Amino acid sequence: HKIRVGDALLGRLIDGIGRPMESNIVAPYLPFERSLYAEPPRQVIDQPFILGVRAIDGLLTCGIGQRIGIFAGSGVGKSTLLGMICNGASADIIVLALIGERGREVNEFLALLPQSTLSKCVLVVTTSDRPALERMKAAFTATTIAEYFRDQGKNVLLMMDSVTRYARAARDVGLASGEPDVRGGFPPSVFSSLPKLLERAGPAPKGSITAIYTVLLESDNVNDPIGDEVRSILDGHIVLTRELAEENHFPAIDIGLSASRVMHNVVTSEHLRAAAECKKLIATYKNPELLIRIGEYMGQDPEADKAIKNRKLIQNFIQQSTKDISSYEKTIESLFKVVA
């Protein structure tokens, strides 16, 4: 399978095999063909990739060329977080793959993106009604298009929502060709395709692809062998929880459950220091009502005292509304403030 690509893809809604879906009577100029498949290519990650989300840029800092996972169940602000990242990230180009959701949920995500952001996005969209084959190819189409723009010297953000639903489509395609169930309903081809997909993002001499893949968590206790494999491959993971989202704490990122394997390689030692102390002050906060309620009060307990003192500053730092905008300078300055 070869798809047609070019700069004219920018600002466009594109199907799972790369074809314009909008109603224009004049067709875009897409003069190049590129295969969907890319045999394997090495660079290190040493530059910070800024998302413009304080909790992440401050505490779980990304790197140019990193593979990042966002794990979220239903109704925890996944889409809002993803919108914020598109609107705030330091990328020249964003290639989005929106895979497996109904047309309503796609449009609700798109309404989060203003004109200035859309003008630098390729939007690869394959809703749940589309054939499994098309939903599967969407992940390759999107990655190839990101490769195309990387090859132009662009710092590209590849955003795939979701790898979970890519894998379901790849599964249905595989089982159809005769493959048996090996683990959790998934055939062998799906598993072999994951590293091949993810090995294609990374830093580069010309440009880069930094990639974010979402993993949808189900509200059951059924194993997800796709999530397992992705966890082992990623250079970072961001975990959203229903517990935080129920507090109207957004983004609903559980800092203790999240991590960046590249952060220490991309921030100053002092920034790493303040982040660790911020994380401790988050983890050791306990509602003061729990002690007042039993005869108030410190000791003698110094760390947990700061946590109370800093609660508002910390919560106002990690919580962040959809149109709150935060440069890397201001995020870092704010971070030092919260741990004083």
Ligand X SMILES: Nc1ncnc2c1ncn2[C@@H]1O[C@H](COP(=O)(O)OP(=O)(O)O)[C@@H](O)[C@H]1O
Give the residues lining the site for Ca ion (CB under 5 A): 223
193 binds ligand X (CB under 6 A): no
User: What is the smallest separation between the CB atom of 330 and ligand X, expressed in angstroms?
Assistant: 17
Applying CB under 6 A, among 47, 66, 79, 127 the residue interacting with ligand X is 79
Q: Does 16 bind ligand X (CB under 6 A)?
A: no
Nearer to ligand X, 78 or 171 (CB): 78
State which residue, 223 or 327, has the beta carbon closest to Ca ion.
223
Q: Which does 77 bind (CB under 5 to 8 A by kind): ligand X, Ca ion, none?
A: ligand X
> What are 68's strand-pairing partners?
212, 236
Q: Which CB, 223 or 287, lies closer to Ca ion?
A: 223
Beta strand pairing status for 208-216 and 202-203?
Answer: antiparallel
Kindly indicate which of the ranges 10-18, 69-77, 253-261, 300-308 contains the residues binding ligand X, using the contact rule CB under 6 A: 69-77
DSSP string, 141-164: HHHHHHHHHHTTT-EEEEEEETHH
Q: Does residue 128 touch ligand X according to CB under 6 A?
A: no
Check residue 218 and report its DSSP letter: P
Distance of CA 98 to the CA centre of its chain: 12
Kindly state whether residue 191 participates in binding ligand X, applying the rule CB under 6 A. no
Q: Nearest approach, Cβ of 242 to Ca ion (angstroms)?
A: 17
Distance CA 329, CA 50 (A): 10
Among the listed residues 97, 171, 198, the one whose alpha carbon sits nearest the alpha carbon of residue 138: 97
**What dihedral do alpha carbons 214, 219, 221, 226 form, nearest 10°?**
-20
Bridge pairing between strands 236-239 and 67-72: parallel
Give which of ligand X, Ca ion, none residue 117 binds (C-beta under 5 to 8 Å, depending on kind): none
For the CB of residue 163, give the shortest distance to Ca ion in the complex, in Å.
Answer: 14
**Which of 78/120 has CB closer to ligand X?**
78
54 is a site residue for ligand X (CB under 6 A): no
**Cβ count within 10 A of residue 176:** 11
Tell me which of 107, 119, 321, 327 binds ligand X, using CB under 6 A. 321
223 binds, among ligand X, Ca ion, none (CB under 5 to 8 A by kind): Ca ion
Identify which of 249, 238, 230 has the alpha carbon closest to the alpha carbon of residue 166. 230
CB nearer to ligand X: pick between 142 and 252: 252
- Number of neighbouring beta carbons within 10 Å of residue 230: 23
| Cα–Cα distance measured from residue 276 to residue 294, given in angstroms and rounded to the nearest whole number | 31
Size of the site for ligand X (CB under 6 A): 11
Is 316 among the residues that bind ligand X (CB under 6 A)? Answer: no
Residue 268: alpha-carbon gap to chain centroid: 23
Name the minimum Å distance from CB 80 to ligand X: 3
Q: Which residue ranges make up the site for ligand X (CB under 6 A)?
A: 74-75, 77-80, 250-251, 320-322
